[PDB]
Amino acid sequence: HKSEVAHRFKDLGEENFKALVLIAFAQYLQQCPFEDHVKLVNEVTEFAKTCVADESAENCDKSLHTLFGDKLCTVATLRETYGEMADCCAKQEPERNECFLQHKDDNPNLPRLVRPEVDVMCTAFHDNEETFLKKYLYEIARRHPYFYAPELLFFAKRYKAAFTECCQAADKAACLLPKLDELRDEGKASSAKQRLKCASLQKFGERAFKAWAVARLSQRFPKAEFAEVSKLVTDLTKVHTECCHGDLLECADDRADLAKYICENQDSISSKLKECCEKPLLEKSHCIAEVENDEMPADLPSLAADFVESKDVCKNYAEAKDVFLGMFLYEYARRHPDYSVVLLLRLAKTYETTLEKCCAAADPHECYAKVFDEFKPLVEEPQNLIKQNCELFEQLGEYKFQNALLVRYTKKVPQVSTPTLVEVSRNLGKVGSKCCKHPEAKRMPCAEDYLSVVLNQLCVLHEKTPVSDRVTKCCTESLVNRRPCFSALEVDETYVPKEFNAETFTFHADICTLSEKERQIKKQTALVELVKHKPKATKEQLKAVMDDFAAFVEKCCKADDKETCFAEEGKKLVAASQAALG
Ligand SMILES: CCCCCCCCCCCCCC(=O)OC[C@H]1COP(=S)([S-])O1
Ligand SMILES: CCCCCCCCCCCCCC(=O)OC[C@H]1COP(=S)([S-])O1
Ligand SMILES: CCCCCCCCCCCCCC(=O)OC[C@H]1COP(=S)([S-])O1
């Protein structure tokens, strides 16, 4: 452990070094221009080469935290642009690093990234691949300062990948846009996931974390023994506390350590891990984290014998409540890779509650004999909601399913601003489209994965700008209750129709030719506004107005005077619609 900077440089290679160093700096020095970072990354890459050459070269023996910090404190911008972050520079490691970390801006205040036009991207990528890509890595990293830098990097490669394939196809646009689309969505899910995982530990607590991890691991590693699973829970629990409450390097090593452990112990954990364990170490923690579930062992006993029929049920649980509960979780989850983790947690909490009651009562065995019956309707409630929505998704297709949702949710919580309802409803559609393509057995974990981030960003947004007690309630509920709390929102009976504003419902020739996304958003925006303005309109009535709007758009995009048609036919569409909805 002589020269840490050389150790990493060799561990990572030059390409990954420079990328990670670029990200690391963009994440802390979020306002600085790209070229300033690129100079900081050269300076640091040049400097690191020496340490690979001569470990006893100067400064090469310094810790990474020290090097990184020294480097941050050299930037001329520091006090002017980052205020008190400059003050971290008067402190010594380890409090200097700690200080640098407390001052990172959760939400930078920056314009969004304009997806440029496909010509422009493919030309930049041809003309100057390095700068194109890295500039986008900086832009994303500065906008996502907590995003675990090696997770960013893995995205970048997929981007690059898409550009290689797509920048040389006939119809570049249609090779690439769906790839950019999926990647954008995945990238957001992924950053949102990480915010959720660190928030949820503070919020829901450590017992819940462990309960989540147990469930999750056990589905993935169903051949593993409770002992091995428990061990993994504990290290993963540590690992998450370091990645959430600590900095990059603590986390990377904590992660390489768990990965290393896992790869040494594969036969005790999973037969599915060999591809991952022969990845370069950087990718190794990631590949593991995304591995398929190992096959269940065959002929697994029913859980009745250990958890219901045994007369030691109350004794074994009392001896150690959490251990028995976790073993419950382990057994239930390894058998059910088809459940969301969170459903598995509802199940275990129902069991726990059932045991706290029954173990005190006159005849404990009799009282908890019906506990597995308590499970059926917990399991079947999300299996039925998936089925209903995926049937509907099939019928309507993504866009009209998003429109069905908008109406549903606008009537639920009509106080939510219109863009948020649009985004959220577009995102829920994207989730449907994603998860409904999986078979029934993979629907629930999928849904849990994306919904959990959709719903948590909704709650992060709404916390900032509360407009509903009902949304607050769902956002502050327990882990197991949040989603069912959302599913139980009803139509808001007390809401006062929004006032009519004719401009809102005016439309132009442009709507005929805008990009698909753009065109949808404008229509969906207006649909939200319509439900806000006419919240007691029936489905039949809203379909009538949407059928008219449809006919209006189709006519005015076939007209030769489009500008005139849109102002005149649209005047009349409005008038008709106002009379129709009283
Ligand atoms: C402001 C509007 C926000 C709307 C959010 C409403 C709740 C989302 C309902 C989505 C329907 C999809 C099916 C479904 O909910 O099941 C998902 C599984 C995954 O975790 P669980 S709680 S076991 O349920
Ligand atoms: C996944 C990569 C590493 C392997 C397992 C890591 C364990 C993750 C630790 C706990 C994460 C908790 C996040 C959470 O509480 O999710 C909220 C869910 C439950 O209902 P919904 S609203 S669908 O969202
Ligand atoms: C009563 C106040 C005035 C309201 C007049 C409102 C008419 C327009 C309302 C927004 C448009 C409804 C949303 C809608 O267009 O979606 C339906 C589908 C039908 O085919 P497309 S044109 S691809 O869009």
Author numbering: 3 to 584
Tell me, in the authors' exact words, what the paper reports:
As molecules of highly lipidic character found in the circulatory system, cPAs are bound and transported by the main extracellular lipid binding protein–serum albumin. Serum albumin is a three-domain helical protein which binds up to seven medium or long chain fatty acids (FAs). Here, we present the detailed interactions between human serum albumin (HSA) and equine serum albumin (ESA) with a derivative of cPA, 1-O-myristoyl-sn-glycerol-2,3-cyclic phosphorodithioate (Myr-2S-cPA). The crystal structures of the investigated albumin complexes show a different number and location of Myr-2S-cPA binding sites in both proteins, indicating a species-dependent manner of cPA binding.
The structure of HSA–Myr-2S-cPA, determined at the resolution of 2.26 Å in the P1 space group with two monomers of HSA in the asymmetric unit, reveals three unique binding sites of Myr-2S-cPA in each monomer. The identified binding sites of Myr-2S-cPA in HSA are: Drug Site 2 (DS2) of subdomain IIIA, fatty acid site 5 (FA5) of subdomain IIIB and the chamber created at the interface between domains II and III, which is formed in the elongation of Drug Site I (DS1) of subdomain IIA. Myr-2S-cPA/1 is located in the DS2 pocket, a typical binding site for more bulky molecules. The electrostatic interactions involve both sulfur atoms of the ligand, which are hydrogen bonded with the side chains of Ser342, Arg348 and Arg485. The aliphatic chain of Myr-2S-cPA/1 spreads across the big central chamber and anchors in the hydrophobic part of DS2. The aliphatic chain of Myr-2S-cPA/2 is anchored at the bottom of the FA5 via the van der Waals contacts with the side chains of Phe502, Phe507, Phe509, Leu532, Phe551, Leu575, Val576, and extends up to the entrance, where the polar head of the ligand is placed. The cyclic head of Myr-2S-cPA/2 is oriented alongside the side chain of Lys525 and forms two hydrogen bonds between its sulfur atoms and Nζ of Lys525. The Myr-2S-cPA/3 is bound in the site located at the interface of domains II and III, in the centre of serum albumin molecule. The terminal part of the aliphatic tail of Myr-2S-cPA/3 is placed in the central compartment of DS1 of subdomain IIA; however its central part and the polar head, after the passage between Trp214 and Phe211, crosses the normal boundaries of DS1 through a narrow tunnel to reach an additional chamber. Myr-2S-cPA/3 is not directly hydrogen bonded to the protein; however, there are water-mediated bonds created between the ligand and two waters.
